[PDB]
RNA sequence: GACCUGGGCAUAGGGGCGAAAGACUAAUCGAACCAUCUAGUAGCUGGUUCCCUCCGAAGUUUCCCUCAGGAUAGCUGGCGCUCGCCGAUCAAGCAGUUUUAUCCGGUAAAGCCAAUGACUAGAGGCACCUAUUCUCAAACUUUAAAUGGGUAAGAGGCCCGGCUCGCUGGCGCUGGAGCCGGGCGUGGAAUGCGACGCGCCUAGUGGGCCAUUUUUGGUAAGCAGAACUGGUGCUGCGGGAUGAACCGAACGCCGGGUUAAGGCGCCCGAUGCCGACGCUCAUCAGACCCCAUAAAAGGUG
RNA sequence: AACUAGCCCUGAAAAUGGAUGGCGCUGGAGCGUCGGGCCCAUACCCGGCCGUCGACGGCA
RNA sequence: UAAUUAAAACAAAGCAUCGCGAAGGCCCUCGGCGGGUGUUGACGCGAUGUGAUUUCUGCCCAGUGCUCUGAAUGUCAAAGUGAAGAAAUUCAACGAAGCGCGGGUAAACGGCGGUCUUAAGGUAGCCAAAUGCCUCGUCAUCUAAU
RNA sequence: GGCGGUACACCUGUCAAACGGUAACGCAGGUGUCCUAAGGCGAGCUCAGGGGGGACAGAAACCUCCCGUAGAGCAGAAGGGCAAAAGCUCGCUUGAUCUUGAUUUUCAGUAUGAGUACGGACCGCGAAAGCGGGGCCUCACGAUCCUUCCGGCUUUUGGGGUUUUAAGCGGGAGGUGUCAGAAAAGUUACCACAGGGAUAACUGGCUUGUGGCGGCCAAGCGUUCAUAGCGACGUCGCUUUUUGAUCCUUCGAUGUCGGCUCUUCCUAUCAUUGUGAAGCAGAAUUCACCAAGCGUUGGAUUGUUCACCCACUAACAGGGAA
RNA sequence: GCUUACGGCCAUACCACCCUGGAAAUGCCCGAUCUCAUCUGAACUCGGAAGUAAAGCAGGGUCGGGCCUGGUUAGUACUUGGAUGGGAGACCGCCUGGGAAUACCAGGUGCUGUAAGCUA
């Protein structure tokens, strides 16, 4: 296909696959969660992200290639059930390609820029400065392997990425310094891979079900 | 031989050259378009005072 | 190019507010619009009769003609570089009384209320409005309000 | 499109709503002694060829139907031309619709 | 030999003649030459003749068998005229500007645990169902700016009385409107300005181009197409070596002074300061808007 | 020991001989942060003159 | 093809078709029933195609065109005819050639297919040709190599 | 340019940057219709969907209950709007009628088209208030001339009268889709003219998709062993020896393919000089570095650049210089 | 305070469930002769007064859902204007002004006009 230098900058408005943009090929990446995705919150406390530093658009092929690069390194260093990689960028922006412009012809309705609006070529994920690309939650002693697994996957992406070990507990939105205190007060309950926030502002029957 | 289709580039500078004058609301504005039944009685109230 | 349709681009301006659909509240129907009063123009998609054009939505004019269900308004419309006085017929569901001159009429009655006091007291209290004057000289006490030292916080990624 | 053969519309000569007989209007025979026909033959006579334009590129598929409304009043049988919108199929007798049927 | 050739003859222009090439028909042939109609027409090239003074554009709107042109509006000029200052910022009136008040909007952002649509993951309950979760919209949106659009900031006002009406109607005052008279300047935001007042006639132009920002198609383009404003065309001058457009600043002829942008080793006016602190060695160093390319990735320099 | 940030280096190949403008500059004439002084535009200020415009202008 | 093309182009004999018996065919003239063919008469004149000889010249008359009928039902001018009307006029019948309908005709223009199918479905021949894109086809031969 | 398409007259959403306006052969669509009701009015009714049930009867026939903000429907494209409506059903209807002007949109503020508010007639529906002069709104359409029809005690047919005829006045229709509206098939390689670098076919310039070339990461190959030599999935570049894209220069002309000839230049180095590396024992070969000093051939076929083959050779490297 | 008639704003008024209440009034309720009305006096229409709170209705309740208001988010996001600011670029910082939204948290949950009537 066309090199990623041509569809790197968010130059056009977001052009999603919808009722109007028909004929989009399937994105290269179809799986976004890997590892032991069916793990509890207290099993993978650590969390590290691949934060984007540039306002660009990553192709679905790069998201798929970096996912495989990060997945293979986590298996050989932490086991197939010692991590949970979550690609947090879904390719929704559809990039277009113009016709295979040739010398001339008595057909194709054009030869040059006449009717230049192109057909859907692929899908990219418009990422923002500070937006997480990939997230990996592992055990506390696997920090060196996650930083290296995400560092190798940066080479599959254009631009500049930063590997940041988050202060949040796992894939939740609560800090580690506040997580274990909220479990004791029954304010958070484990719901699958993460926790579900339970406020003190519902029916009291739901409060009795916790205690 | 293609050309430029539409432009409003120099128009604002041409509009304010002689100024964009607001319509002069003269005293005793005209009575065109008022209700014909209302005007009919109004012309009867003027020929009897 | 575009179409010259009478409602091209009116997808949101003629729509109704969220959770404000249904019948028009009847107080809007029982408002009296005399001749020469200032009214706003806000078209409604519910009443498809007597609608103003999209160029008058948000404009303000005075009433010159009153009918059974509608009112004649004299509105200013800039075409290219000239402003023209347009006489449009709009039903009362698309208009409302303009509170623009209400602040003026409130001040007129208040000016006449304060100057007749001068003829009965002998003062010259100024009636003109004045822009926000520079703040006068004041003392800022620190008795129970000590200046707190602020510092720029370190960076956190 | 079907319109009934009877219409109780306004009669301009009766100054009142009267029943009318609706009939589709037909153009009629062109007179050989109309002024435009007399000078068209004078212009087309002799040598010179076709002197007037002959319209070729027609685009309309149908035409506006005209209804000849004749008043049924015995003393006032006044006609009136009433045109309706363009329709490809126009019938005057017609059979009225029935909803709850097959 | 369907040979070559003289002279005399015949065929004349849309005609001749042609063993055919549109060949030949007096150096002229896909229609000879001469004269005339004729100074044929050309929305198309070219040129269009003295000086100074003042004002000064347009490449946009609509229509056109229009798109190399016109009509039309705009922009331009000229001619005035009505006044105001004179005769006291008298006050009005006006404004590509604020202020105050009042409306208008659905773009940025935000949101989808809110609807429409798209999409990831587990979990609970008896494939669904419930509570959560990842990620999105230009033709989605509860919400919602900045900038912006309209209007109102007085005597053409405010208040009061009487009168008229065929309209309106329980109620000549029930509305409403009109007419007439009277009362009240502390002209009741800021700033600026004589009214860019009222007309008439009117040339040129109707190929534009460029920059910041916004923005569409395109891999991109010194590409194509838009929006605001400026510039340019129409414009020289200081600076960017050079230059259409960048930066500064717009121009009668001069002297002095001082600056802008940019500079001050030498070319080359100006640091020929005993300038401050640090960084930096390059066997392709580096050297300033536009701008005359350089990246990912690396270095125990 | 990891990471990061400046300058420099590698990455870095085009055809006539050549371009921080040139010379050259390496306690600099380079880079970054700044100070003082200084240089001149048809810009600004003062004055002279020319013309135009305006004068709520002056004289029979 | 004078003055860029001498040729495979033109002509050619041969072959074949077409028209015409003279009040004719073909053609000329503004015109004369004037003129050419024609001082001619079908072994002739005029109009085309093919192109010596040899060998053959298939199939298609649907389309187009030409031509032949008129037990020719239509379409159908001027004039003439009938009727109505003060008349202008209107209406009606009649109604040539030609068209339509029918037949013939391809050495007339032309055409000559993937159980489907049309009008006939490329026959005898010939060929990667002066005609084959794919293509510098495949094989053989010709050369160290084409 | 032609072919295609219609961006030629219109409509919706978006583009459009929160008034309005705003372009491209921008995007997603629609239109030349349809409807005597699918118009008007009144009354009653509530839809889509889901659930519980109930002979035949089932995942879908019909009855019934509950929930149901409309998630249905409203002729059509889309947007908007709509719940005792604008939807459904029913029974009464012809406001889809006759007229004058004002007015909105497109706009020059012209016409036409499409709308709005009135006034004056005559009516429909409803007990009534009221509602309606077509379609819930935004689209569904046409000048002059001519023809045709309707309308008028009202004109002219002129030296008068009567009667035909004709003309005229007022209003419809017959149509111009290139939709502000000519009546209109090609070809020219025999060509001509006025022009155009407003506009193609060269070079050059910008761009580099494509072509060519070089990197980064390291899954994997290499018996084992990522990195001797290679490099999947990705990704960053360079080059202007490919082709395009563009139309800036040139149409009062820059001679147009290839070869021959001849000079110089570039290195992205085939050979040769000096080296490093190996999955380097030798020989041969491969990778890489300094490096363009020097060399890079003779032929068959084709007009060929490009190919292919024959031999020779240290090697028979690739290019630029309009 | 409450019950009705007509309303205004149109959820602070809605929705679910629970509890309480009949003084007047309201509602249910009792009937189909008449008017009227349907497959069916259920509805609609009409006639009535045996019962009185089951429902409607009203008033409470719920760490209720929704809605409303405010805080937080946040001077964050975005944005007017400026630079010969940075960076290869993508973009970012600053200057000058304007200034959001969700999550989250807290409070609240109909107000009121005209007319008539009644003090459980
Ligand atoms: Mg154009
Ligand atoms: Mg133009
Ligand atoms: Mg559109
Ligand atoms: Mg329209
Ligand atoms: Mg309507
Ligand atoms: Mg004749
Ligand atoms: Mg001779
Ligand atoms: Mg001639
Ligand atoms: Mg020829
Ligand atoms: Mg002349
Ligand atoms: Mg053109
Ligand atoms: Mg020209
Ligand atoms: Mg002009
Ligand atoms: Mg003009
Ligand atoms: Mg352009
Ligand atoms: Mg100028
Ligand atoms: Mg200048
Ligand atoms: Mg320079
Ligand atoms: Mg000086
Ligand atoms: Mg210098
Ligand atoms: Mg780097
Ligand atoms: Mg390396
Ligand atoms: Mg370097
Ligand atoms: Mg001076
Ligand atoms: Mg010759
Ligand atoms: Mg010869
Ligand atoms: Mg031959
Ligand atoms: Mg023969
Ligand atoms: Mg033949
Ligand atoms: Mg035949
Ligand atoms: Mg042929
Ligand atoms: Mg055969
Ligand atoms: Mg138009
Ligand atoms: Mg705007
Ligand atoms: Mg319509
Ligand atoms: Mg009426
Ligand atoms: Mg006659
Ligand atoms: Mg046209
Ligand atoms: Mg050009
Ligand atoms: Mg490439
Ligand atoms: Mg291996
Ligand atoms: Mg690769
Ligand atoms: Mg251009
Ligand atoms: Mg020359
Ligand atoms: Mg030249
Ligand atoms: Mg030359
Ligand atoms: Mg080298
Ligand atoms: Mg190697
Ligand atoms: Mg109870
Ligand atoms: Mg709550
Ligand atoms: Zn009648």
Swiss-Prot record, chain A:
It is found in: Cytoplasm. Gene3D superfamilies: 3.30.60.300, Ribosomal protein L10e/L16 (3.90.1170.10). Keywords: Cytoplasm, Developmental protein, Ribonucleoprotein, Ribosomal protein. GO terms for biological process: brain development; embryonic brain development; regulation of translation; translation. Disruption phenotype: Morpholino knockdown of the protein decreases head size, but not body length at 2 days post-fertilization (dpf). Show decreased formation of actively translating ribosomes. Pfam families: Ribosomal_L16. One of its GO terms (molecular function) is translation regulator activity. Signal peptide: none annotated. One of its GO terms (cellular component) is cytosolic large ribosomal subunit. InterPro entries: Ribosomal_uL16, Ribosomal_uL16_CS_euk_arc, Ribosomal_uL16_dom, Ribosomal_uL16_euk_arch, Ribosomal_uL16_sf. It comes from the Eukaryota. Component of the large ribosomal subunit. Component of the large ribosomal subunit. Plays a role in the formation of actively translating ribosomes. Plays a role in the embryonic brain development. Belongs to the universal ribosomal protein uL16 family. This is Large ribosomal subunit protein uL16. It comes from Danio rerio (Zebrafish).
Swiss-Prot record, chain D:
SUPFAM superfamilies: Zn-binding ribosomal proteins (SSF57829). Component of the large ribosomal subunit. The ribosome is a large ribonucleoprotein complex responsible for the synthesis of proteins in the cell. Component of the large ribosomal subunit. This is Large ribosomal subunit protein eL42. InterPro entries: Ribosomal_eL44 (IPR000552), Ribosomal_LSU_eL42 (IPR053708), Ribosomal_zn-bd (IPR011332). Keywords: Cytoplasm, Ribonucleoprotein, Ribosomal protein. Its main location: cytoplasm. GO terms for biological process: chordate embryonic development; regulation of cell cycle; translation. PROSITE patterns: RIBOSOMAL_L44E. GO terms for molecular function: structural constituent of ribosome. It is found in: Cytoplasm. Pfam families: Ribosomal_L44. The keyword Cytoplasm applies. GO terms for cellular component: cytosolic large ribosomal subunit. Residues 25-52 are annotated as: Disordered. It comes from Danio rerio (Zebrafish). The keyword Cytoplasm applies. Belongs to the eukaryotic ribosomal protein eL42 family.
